[PDB]
């Protein structure tokens, strides 16, 4: 079965670009990390860094997460991020996602031994 970690690069890594996202890029990278297939996930995140990188936050400044949890890490640097949030004309199996690059502080939770990111929480 997929890890909680594994599905955290799954749902929110891609390494493979450096920022590229055309405006085409949410459309399809949604469905294909199998973000459509049950339903048209409304907002997702994904971080274009190394693994290593990603990783390195879970030891780097903690702060609150956002339903209270006290296991959130933000990234001392900024990250190259896109976001994807669902249009209002999207309709499901049809998904359709505005494609938005930006550069930011990712804040991830981290669980685990080894302790790994295994949730986007925000951008700031
Ligand atoms: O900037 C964000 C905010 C939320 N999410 C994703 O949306 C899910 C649900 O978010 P929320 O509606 O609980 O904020 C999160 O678990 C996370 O996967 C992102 O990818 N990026
Ligand atoms: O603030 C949070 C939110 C979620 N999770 C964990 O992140 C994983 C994926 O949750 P989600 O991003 O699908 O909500 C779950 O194992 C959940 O317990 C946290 O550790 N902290």
Redesign the pocket.
């Given at each position: 079965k997929e890890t909680?970690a594994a599905?955290?690069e799954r749902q929110h890594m891609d390494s493979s670009t450096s920022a590229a996202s055309s405006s085409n890029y949410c459309n399809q990278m949604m469905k294909s990390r199998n973000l459509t297939k049950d339903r048209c996930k409304p907002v997702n995140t994904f971080v274009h860094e190394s693994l290593a990188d990603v990783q390195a936050v879970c030891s780097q400044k903690n702060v609150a997460?956002?339903?209270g949890?006290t296991?959130?890490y933000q990234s001392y640097s900024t990250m190259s991020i896109t976001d994807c949030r669902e249009t209002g004309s999207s309709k499901y199996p049809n998904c359709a996602y505005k494609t938005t690059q930006a550069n930011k502080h990712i804040i991830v939770?981290?669980?685990g031994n080894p302790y790994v990111p295994?949730?986007?929480?925000a951008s700031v």
């Amino acid at each position: 079965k997929e890890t909680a970690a594994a599905k955290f690069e799954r749902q929110h890594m891609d390494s493979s670009t450096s920022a590229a996202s055309s405006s085409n890029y949410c459309n399809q990278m949604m469905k294909s990390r199998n973000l459509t297939k049950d339903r048209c996930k409304p907002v997702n995140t994904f971080v274009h860094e190394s693994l290593a990188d990603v990783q390195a936050v879970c030891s780097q400044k903690n702060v609150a997460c956002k339903n209270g949890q006290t296991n959130c890490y933000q990234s001392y640097s900024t990250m190259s991020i896109t976001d994807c949030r669902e249009t209002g004309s999207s309709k499901y199996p049809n998904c359709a996602y505005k494609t938005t690059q930006a550069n930011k502080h990712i804040i991830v939770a981290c669980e685990g031994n080894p302790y790994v990111p295994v949730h986007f929480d925000a951008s700031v």
